């Protein structure tokens, strides 16, 4: 058994690959709202989220529950966040995407209604509402894909705060090191061609090279799915 790969080590769940969950502020999700209900809350603070490197808003709701929300750009302390099917479609409000006009920017979008918000959550990203239909509503993802969602899926109106985070180059291994201390990701990473053959499919050889094509089949088993996985194509576009 030429040793297991880094991906298999991470799947094992060892401490080297686990997130420092105790360092994080909140499991960001929409407040739980019953069918045909609404809740209002006011923003009391804007805090740094170590798990995302983007601000989060602390919201005190009418029901006596205090919750951390994924902050949209422009959300300010003292703002009244409304969440409901009848809520005004305004930045920071959590409304169903069936009530959002075409061309509006949404974020923290539920995969299914009441899911808590799955898509469009990183700093600066946003989704655009494209079409409305009777049972489906379509949005353009930050990836460019068109996603057909239930119109009852809730989303906060606006874009995610923290835009331009990666415009500043790391410039230095130490800065990225400090970012990686709060993440599960292993830093730094050794290239596979630099490893021995017992440690990677690409390892070994008198000189550094994979020895086999780096595009691997989608059928390849664990310990073998390395390099370009099921690549449609390779190279820079001609």
């Amino acid at each position: 058994m030429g040793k297991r790969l880094i991906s298999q080590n991470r799947g094992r769940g060892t401490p080297t690959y686990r997130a420092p969950s105790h360092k994080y502020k909140a499991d960001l999700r929409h407040p739980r709202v019953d069918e045909n209900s609404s809740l209002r809350g006011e923003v009391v603070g804007i805090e740094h989220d170590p798990a995302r490197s983007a601000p989060i808003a602390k919201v005190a709701f009418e029901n006596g529950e205090e919750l951390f929300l994924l902050a949209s750009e422009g959300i300010a302390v003292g703002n009244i966040i409304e969440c409901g099917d009848d809520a005004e479609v305004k930045p920071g409000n959590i409304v169903p995407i069936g009530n959002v006009p075409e061309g509006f920017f949404i974020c923290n979008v539920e995969s299914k209604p009441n899911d808590g918000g799955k898509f469009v959550r990183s700093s600066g990203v946003y989704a655009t509402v494209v079409t409305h239909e009777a049972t489906r509503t379509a949005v353009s993802m930050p990836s460019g894909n068109i996603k057909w969602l239930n119109p009852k899926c809730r989303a906060v109106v606006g874009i995610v705060a923290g835009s331009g985070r990666v415009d500043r180059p790391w410039l230095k291994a130490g800065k990225k090191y400090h970012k990686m201390k709060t993440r599960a990701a292993k830093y730094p990473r050794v290239s596979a061609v630099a490893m021995n053959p017992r440690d990677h499919p690409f390892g070994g050889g008198a000189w550094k090279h994979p020895g086999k094509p780096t595009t691997v089949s989608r059928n390849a088993p664990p310990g073998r799915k390395v390099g370009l996985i099921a690549a449609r194509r390779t190279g820079m576009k001609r």
Partner: protein, 94 residues
């Protein structure tokens, strides 16, 4: 009013803290980012250039205490302002 901007000194800007490290391209990028982020930013609540970054994406007004979530290095992005202008045009039209 500013530093002794010598005959050659106006290139590194705040990226002079890095010396000859990291290449000219990324030093220029970081220097431009610092210049844009250190600029005065007008408060949307009191309308004076007193908005400073309190954290990564967190901005506060030194006068009125207005704190909000914005860009990482800029209080207001162009996409967010586009959203605001779309909603404002809709509101005006009706």
């Amino acid at each position: 009013m500013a530093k002794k901007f010598t005959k050659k000194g106006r290139i590194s800007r705040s990226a002079g803290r890095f010396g000859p490290r990291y290449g000219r391209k990324d030093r220029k990028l970081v220097a431009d980012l610092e210049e844009r982020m250190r600029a005065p930013h007008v408060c949307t609540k009191c309308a004076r250039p007193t908005v400073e970054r309190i954290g990564t994406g967190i901005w506060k007004c030194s006068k009125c205490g207005h704190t909000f979530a914005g860009g990482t290095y800029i209080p207001y992005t162009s996409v967010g302002q586009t959203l605001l202008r779309t909603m404002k045009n809709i509101a005006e039209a009706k």
